[PDB]
Structures are given as structure tokens and as C-alpha cells.
Amino acid sequence: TTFVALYDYESRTETDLSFKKGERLQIVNNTEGDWWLAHSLSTGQTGYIPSNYVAPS
Amino acid sequence: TTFVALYDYESRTETDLSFKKGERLQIVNNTEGDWWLAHSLSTGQTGYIPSNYVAPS
Numbered sequence: 768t769t770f771v772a773l774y775d776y777e778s779r780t781e782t783d784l785s786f787k788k789g790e791r792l793q794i795v796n797n798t799e800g801d802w803w804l805a806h807s808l809s810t811g812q813t814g815y816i817p818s819n820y821v822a823p824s
Numbered sequence: 825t826t827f828v829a830l831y832d833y834e835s836r837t838e839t840d841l842s843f844k845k846g847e848r849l850q851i852v853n854n855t856e857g858d859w860w861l862a863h864s865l866s867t868g869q870t871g872y873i874p875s876n877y878v879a880p881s
């Protein structure tokens with residue numbers, strides 16, 4: 768399955784992909800899965816996490 | 825709503841959250857959506873993208 772960008776996106780870090788509206792993109796799976804923005808109740812820190820490392824409470 | 829870590833995870837960039845197995849985490853709504861690892865057919869580049877910027881071809 769192929770996706771198409773609806774907006775431009777300029778990369779902000781070393782690990783993200785820049786692209787332009789109309790570019791065609793294939794998702795590639797990996798062991799980490801989707802990444803979610805998360806907030807830790809144990810430490811107060813915040814950032815993206817790999818969804819395959821966690822489970823619901 | 826609330827998740828639990830199954831593994832340790834050490835941060836690799838400035839934007840990800842480190843955590844330890846057992847930490848409680850809350851996912852936080854933001855406009856970007858899940859982030860996916862993606863491969864560009866126009867440029868050959870690879871990296872994570874915000875799913876809400878793309879749509880299927």
C-alpha cells in the first residue's frame with residue numbers, strides 16, 4: 768500500500784523524513800511499530816515512544 | 825488511556841522518551857498523529873513521518 772503526502776513537511780531531527788505535497792510514500796514495518804507521543808507518570812518527562820514496547824493498564 | 829512499559833528503552837535522539845519496564849505512560853493527543861517509518865519513492869530517502877500528513881494512493 769502506497770501513500771501520498773497532503774502537505775509539505777520539513778524534517779526537524781536526524782531521524783525524520785522531509786517531503787513535499789504529492790510525494791509518494793511506502794510505509795515499511797519494523798519491530799518498533801508506530802510511535803506515539805507519551806507522558807511518563809513516573810518521571811514527568813515527555814517524548815515519543817515505540818508503541819510495541821508498552822501495553823494498556 | 826494509561827499504558828505500562830514492558831521493556832526498558834533508552835532515548836536515541838532529543839525527541840524520544842527514555843523509560844524503564846513498569847513505568848506508567850499516558851498517550852497525549854497532538855495534531856501529527858502516530859509516526860510511521862516511511863520510504864520516499866520520489867527521493868529515495870527514509871525516515872519517520874507524521875501519519876496525519878499523508879493519505880493513501
